[PDB]
């Protein structure tokens with residue numbers, strides 16, 4: 001009945017597109033669905049904490065979460081909802097700009113029925129990209145931005 | 161450099177969404193992209209024959225083809241473009257409503273670097289679905305339409 | 321339920337290994353399994369639950385009827401691949417097929433691709449290109465034989481990418 | 488050039504078979520290969536097969552550093568049971584950054600469905616990550632987890648289907 005699926009990848013790999021592909025497959029079969037997005041990324045409920053939308057999620061069969069890395073309560077929420085019989089689909093970055101685990105996201109992997117890591121195209125050499133390189137000098141993890149602030153990159157380009 | 165990727169599956173499995181996900185990964189990395197759709201499905205560039213858009217395709221790096229099953233020249237076109245260095249990504253039904261090969265699309269498989277078959281949700285029992293059942297009694301292969309005319313189904317529901 | 325899974329790819333892509341991985345997953349969970357291999361392929365690397373050589377899948381239908389999971393190696397060489405898989409899946413067996421999608425000419429190998437529309441699961445594995453070492457999707461024949469069926473391994477064939485193929 | 492590939496899954500999902508499928512693809516194309524196994528897992532079902540012994544280096548270890556010299560001499564390195572190597576991250580990154588293809592089979596989770604050792608730190612480092620499924624040994628649906636049958640509390644308890652079942656979420660929780 002209930003499950004957690006995780007869609008990992010670097011930026012620009014289409015994780016949110018894959019999330020919506022999966023959600024729509026259920027939606028066309030008449031399942032009730034909810035998608036949650038992280039509220040501070042303004043580049044289908046916005047939220048900063050998943051507990052903020054837990055009431056609405058009780059009333060659906062399928063929950064999609066975009067930018068899962070930003071929710072500090074990702075684990076508790078996904079596990080509770082999957083154990084209550086919901087299908088929970090999470091798109092998230094696996095790694096920060098430092099190729100370190102992004103928040104609590106990887107704690108989901110041992111809890112998950114399905115895990116995939118998508119690839120992007122390296123913006124610097126056009127081979128396949130598994131990582132995200134920050135272009136500026138900000139040292140904090142959370143810096144909202146797109147291709148003006150980040151490049152998807154392969155290993156060689158990450159370290160160039 | 162050139163290649164053919166094929167995205168197979170029944171109706172309602174999100175083939176065209178996956179096509180666009182893959183194409184957009186190249187587009188954001190500044191490749192020139194062209195997408196082609198079958199002109200008679202009205203429910204990028206429309207076409208009934210790929211030869212008609214061959215010129216525009218010569219001028220891009222990445223060509224996506226939606227509803228590839230409907231193009232009678234799909235094999236010749238994809239092979240020529242890939243052999244000219246283009247990445248050709250094709251979304252198509254693998255089977256008709258009779259679970260027979262749809263057009264010439266399966267002749268791409270031995271030519272292709274990548275082949276995947278997506279699944280839909282069975283609209284009748286909600287297990288995974290690999291096939292498309294026609295709801296009405298029309299016998300002709302090409303009948304354009306959505307969930308009002310077809311259901312994604314599993315094997316058991318396909319056979320009643 | 322009743323399913324067909326198809327594992328495609330060129331030579332040297334580990335199709336037979338993937339087939340056995342999938343079968344063993346069921347076997348360890350106490351399912352009765354049978355693996356069928358093409359009897360004319362007597363290569364050592366393509367040896368060795370019930371495990372049975374056949375030239376026609378019908379020839380071991382009696383054994384196949386009494387199991388839950390049937391793996392078939394080198395699907396492309398069985399004249400009855402389509403009919404057998406479909407009948408077995410409709411009888412409730414899980415049928416897992418490893419096969420070449422393409423001949424040395426990159427044309428469909430027998431009737432194998434007619435399984436695709438009947439199948440719940442289809443993947444195409446990759447090999448390593450034996451000529452440039454990028455990923456390979458095709459098999460190139462090394463000698464001048466013109467007939468489709470020539471049994472052999474890396475002695476007679478290479479896995480290749482598109483550029484090396486035409487090379 | 489170099490890369491890390493990770494094959495996750497519960498027990499009985501065929502992770503070491505997938506590892507060997509991947510490594511053999513390179514071996515048959517004449518790459519020099521080494522496969523490393525965790526020395527303390529002495530089960531018959533986990534031992535190197537004879538054909539692999541004859542075509543690649545196959546080495547037991549309890550620390551990856553202990554086979555670093557051998558690993559430096561090859562192009563492709565496969566690691567079975569990567570969760571048990573405390574230096575998994577350092578080794579895999581060093582080797583991939585020196586041009587090697589590193590392929591790791593590992594459990595993602597312990598019997599408690601918590602991260603197994605340091606293994607998930609590879610995920611952000613890896614070019615490729617898959618999670619395989621097993622068959623639930625209790626209800627026969629797809630299984631993503633491993634349940635311990637006994638009452639042992641320690642994470643590391645070597646054993647097979649006699650001590651562990653692959654299970655789905657429902658069977659995991661009883």
Ligand SMILES: Cc1cn([C@H]2C[C@H](O)[C@@H](COP(=O)(O)OP(=O)(O)OP(=O)(O)O)O2)c(=O)[nH]c1=O
Nearest residue numbers: 011013014015016096097132141142143144145
């Ligand atoms: C790599 C990285 C990204 N970010 C930010 C940048 C973006 O605002 C955001 C990207 O999150 P994503 O999860 O990549 O957003 P998305 O769901 O749109 O992904 P996709 O394009 O694949 O569909 O996270 C950080 O704050 N810190 C980082 O270290």
Ligand SMILES: Cc1cn([C@H]2C[C@H](O)[C@@H](COP(=O)(O)OP(=O)(O)OP(=O)(O)O)O2)c(=O)[nH]c1=O
Nearest residue numbers: 171172173174175176256257292302303304305
């Ligand atoms: C099965 C079948 C479909 N069709 C038609 C119906 C549709 O108009 C068309 C299917 O287009 P698709 O793009 O395959 O349908 P879809 O939009 O549901 O696909 P997806 O979600 O996977 O992207 O093919 C036939 O004409 N004959 C048939 O045998």
Ligand SMILES: Cc1cn([C@H]2C[C@H](O)[C@@H](COP(=O)(O)OP(=O)(O)OP(=O)(O)O)O2)c(=O)[nH]c1=O
Nearest residue numbers: 331332333334335336423424468469470471472
């Ligand atoms: C390509 C090709 C192969 N063959 C033969 C050669 C082999 O005997 C047989 C292929 O069997 P496979 O099982 O495809 O060969 P393999 O063992 O290398 O594959 P894998 O690593 O994926 O398990 O087909 C032909 O007869 N004609 C052809 O055109």
Ligand SMILES: Cc1cn([C@H]2C[C@H](O)[C@@H](COP(=O)(O)OP(=O)(O)OP(=O)(O)O)O2)c(=O)[nH]c1=O
Nearest residue numbers: 498499500501502503597598633643644645646
């Ligand atoms: C789940 C779990 C396993 N182990 C042990 C048991 C085994 O000795 C080892 C796991 O071996 P694996 O190779 O993960 O198990 P397997 O041989 O069933 O795997 P596969 O079919 O995927 O190839 O780890 C623990 O110590 N703690 C745990 O919590």
Ligand SMILES: [Zn+2]
Nearest residue numbers: 122125154157
């Ligand atoms: Zn690069």
Ligand SMILES: [Zn+2]
Nearest residue numbers: 282285314317
């Ligand atoms: Zn159904």
Ligand SMILES: [Zn+2]
Nearest residue numbers: 449452481484
């Ligand atoms: Zn090549």
Ligand SMILES: [Zn+2]
Nearest residue numbers: 623626655658
């Ligand atoms: Zn179960």
